[PDB]
Symmetry: none
Subunit: 85 residues, 8 copies
Amino acid sequence: ADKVLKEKRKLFIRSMGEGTINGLLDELLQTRVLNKEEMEKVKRENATVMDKTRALIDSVIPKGAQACQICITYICEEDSYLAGT
Amino acid sequence: ADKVLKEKRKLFIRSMGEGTINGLLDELLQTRVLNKEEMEKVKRENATVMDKTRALIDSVIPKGAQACQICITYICEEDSYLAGT
Amino acid sequence: ADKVLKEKRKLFIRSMGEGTINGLLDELLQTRVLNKEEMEKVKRENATVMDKTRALIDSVIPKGAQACQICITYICEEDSYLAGT
Amino acid sequence: ADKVLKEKRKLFIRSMGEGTINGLLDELLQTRVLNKEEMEKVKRENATVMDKTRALIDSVIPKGAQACQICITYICEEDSYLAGT
Amino acid sequence: ADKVLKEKRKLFIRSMGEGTINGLLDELLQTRVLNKEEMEKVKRENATVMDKTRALIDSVIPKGAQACQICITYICEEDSYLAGT
Amino acid sequence: ADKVLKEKRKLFIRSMGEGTINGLLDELLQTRVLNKEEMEKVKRENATVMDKTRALIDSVIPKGAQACQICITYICEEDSYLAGT
Amino acid sequence: ADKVLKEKRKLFIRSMGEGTINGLLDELLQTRVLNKEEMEKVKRENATVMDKTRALIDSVIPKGAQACQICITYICEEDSYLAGT
Amino acid sequence: ADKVLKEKRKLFIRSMGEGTINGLLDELLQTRVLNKEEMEKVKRENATVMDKTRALIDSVIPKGAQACQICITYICEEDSYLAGT
């Protein structure tokens, strides 16, 4: 699916929070999906850390969306009560 | 390939972002590809820093495209999940 | 009504804010009304994110105003205390 | 249809904007319809980037209007809410 | 008075700013004094948005100066500390 | 004195800060000197909120400088240790 | 020296920045060297505020270069580590 | 060496942080290298305070690079485990 899951859809990002996103991010670092520099840049995000979900969408790089398969496997263990899984 | 990679093609520049471009630019400075003055000039770019990818295309100087081999080696380590590499 | 609601009128855009506009925009993305690229371009807007209401007016495309019926249904659930609805 | 769509008509160019035109232009570059030099020349346009729609009309070259079939296929995916399509 | 207020005089346009002009313009749109197209054209103005006061003078159309009675009523509520009112 | 106090002079604006400016602004709103819209626009200011003192100078409208008599009475109670008062 | 310092020379304007230029400008206002209107016009400058050094050169008016003696005294206190002083 | 240390090189600025930069800045104030006004302006920097290292590079004024000898002596006591020293 990859970015195809923008029809999943990203209107439910409202349910995500830093309690698990931070771990996601840590994995994206481990898996060298995102650079530490640009990792830190997420911290620029307006209002709640949650908006950062907008930044996560962005980080579904159009040419790198297959890396979000890593994110999916994180999601799998992340939250068994999350809508969409 | 050099500028030949305009057939690579530059319709996928939509996947790039400042998270790595800034580093690219820093390297172009280090490698004296672009002058600090004109480096700063990138900051003129309309809307998202990303449009700056249009400026990066421009900075594939028709007579200096071989300098983008430096950019390629950056790309190599830049993002292993990027389309086209 | 569509764009006809410019006589609704857009002098009351002064009451809108990013707290709900951001969601509107997200829906315009979901509904493929506006492209992600040009979505990001809204971020160019002078002063308060609110001026962005000027950009929303613009995005009532003269040939695409029927897409703002989607915006109306958003408005319906958006704010039951909003003037004009 | 090609240039025949001047009876489509170009009085509705008022609905176009840089949010999608820029992409169109990028495709005209990719498809080698317009030269990069003359591509840059679009930037001369008076007032709003939008007037550039006047320049787009011009770039419906009388002997090259069939290239605007490429533009049509862009339009198809460009905006499903655009008048005339 | 209408255009007669060029003897009011337009040497005090130096006191105007976009903080209220933008609203004026929005009203000229609402009141269909100026077309949206030519409204956008104001954005061509050299240097500070303020020079736009030169454009406002121009938009005191010689045959349409009575429309500036609308502008006067705007001025009335616009700024109670403005010279000339 | 009004704007005459530009010879007071505005080289000492370096001593002002948001700790009291915000209150000034709130009073300018109360006294309907500045519109809420353009009030919000102050938030556009480069770097420190303090540069906003440049914007305050601007808001000494050439035809509305007598409104800064209100600002003076604010200054009076604002800071008894401020240079110039 | 006055404008004679164009042989000083203005190839080192590359070392100037808004951090001190803004103050210079403020002094040129205080000293009524440049009008507030044309002061604001500096804001038209392409790319980095720094290019504004090109505008500063221009503002070394051929018949008013002695006013830059004021600029020199500013420079004196401006930056004790600046080349040329 | 002075600015010559841009070949040192500024690709390792990635290792710096506010924990010591703030102190550096405080010293630049003490040593009157940078003005308090423009000192505050560093606070404009995008994302992490760290990007501010880009601003530090800028503050290696082309005509004032010898002031960074002060920065070097700071570096000496700053961090004995820092690459390049």
